[PDB]
């Protein structure tokens, strides 16, 4: 397993509930799917959203469940459409983006990298709503529509990435970027 390749985003299913009081003997419990670095961060996000959406804070609440959701087929490529709400330097905007990969966590990592690179939106400014796998016929973004042709092939124009051992300083003759 390549730790240099893996990210640290995981999906957590979290169930919480306000502590029962004399007013209501059994409050309605709430459940959420949260992408975070770890379960502690996921629970912090859960309580943040509890306080923001309901009037329920961690001090007057309790955690009924928190478990990591693992991808059923972590080696099957599928397309994900993710709704998103983030605030910029001058306003708040909701946008819908698309990715394709093997895990919802990986798609979310792609989303965070893209938002940082394209809109300079830090993770503290991003709220993830409604990430869901979508069918190939419902894909909307052309940069993914082009990935779903009948037979897909292209060259490998990338420059070679060698190991440190063979990344030697002095070369006998000029290497070729053509290679392939």
């Amino acid at each position: 397993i390549d730790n240099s390749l893996n990210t640290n985003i995981h999906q957590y299913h979290i169930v919480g509930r306000a502590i029962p009081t004399a007013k209501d003997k059994n409050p309605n419990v709430y459940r959420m799917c949260i992408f975070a670095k770890n379960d502690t961060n996921a629970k912090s996000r859960f309580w943040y959203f509890m306080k923001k959406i309901n009037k329920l804070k961690k001090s007057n609440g309790e955690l009924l469940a928190c478990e990591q959701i693992k991808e059923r087929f972590p080696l099957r490529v599928k397309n994900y459409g993710v709704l998103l709400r983030y605030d910029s330097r001058t306003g708040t905007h909701n946008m819908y983006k698309e990715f394709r990969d093997t895990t919802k966590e990986g798609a979310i990592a792609q989303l965070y990298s893209e938002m940082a690179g394209r809109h300079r939106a830090r993770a503290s400014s991003i709220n993830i709503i409604r990430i869901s796998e979508i069918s190939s016929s419902l894909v909307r973004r052309p940069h993914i529509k082009q990935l779903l042709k009948r037979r897909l092939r292209f060259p490998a124009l990338h420059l070679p990435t060698l190991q440190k051992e063979y990344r030697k300083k002095f070369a006998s003759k000029r290497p070729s970027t053509y290679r392939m």
């Binding site: 975070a36 770890n38 379960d39 502690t40 961060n41 912090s44 993770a123």
Partner: protein, 128 residues
């Protein structure tokens, strides 16, 4: 409630979590020092033996480092006495370093302070 409220106003300068039995045992065995002497004249000594533990805590029937481990891991009846008897642990810097002492563990950016919950165990292991 009292200790948690005290911890709240010190939260940005600490990181804490749930120790688990293995890390409690490792902390007591390889970094456990004890206040041996007269009251207010304690003289920190590494455990190395159950004699001092028996001498000070034996009236609570806590003769033994395993008894201390139990009373610490499970917040047993003799917890204040064991904790006070135990000298404050002097930990090493983390083997692989921190992320950013400036920022919270719960911030989406890398950070360290706050409640790590069960994640304190790996940090203790690198620091011990």
């Amino acid at each position: 409630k009292a200790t948690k409220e005290m911890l709240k106003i010190v939260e940005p300068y600490v990181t804490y979590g749930y120790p688990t039995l293995s890390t409690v045992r490792k902390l007591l065995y390889k970094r456990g020092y004890v206040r041996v002497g007269k009251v207010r004249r304690y003289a920190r000594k590494k455990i190395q033996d159950n004699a001092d533990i028996s001498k000070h805590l034996g009236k609570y029937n806590v003769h033994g480092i395993e008894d201390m481990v139990y009373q610490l891991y499970t917040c047993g009846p003799v917890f204040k006495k064991v904790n006070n008897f135990l000298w404050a642990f002097k930990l090493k810097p983390p083997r692989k370093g921190f992320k950013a002492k400036r920022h919270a563990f719960n911030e989406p950016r890398p950070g360290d302070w706050g409640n790590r919950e069960a994640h304190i165990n790996e940090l203790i292991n690198r620091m011990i």
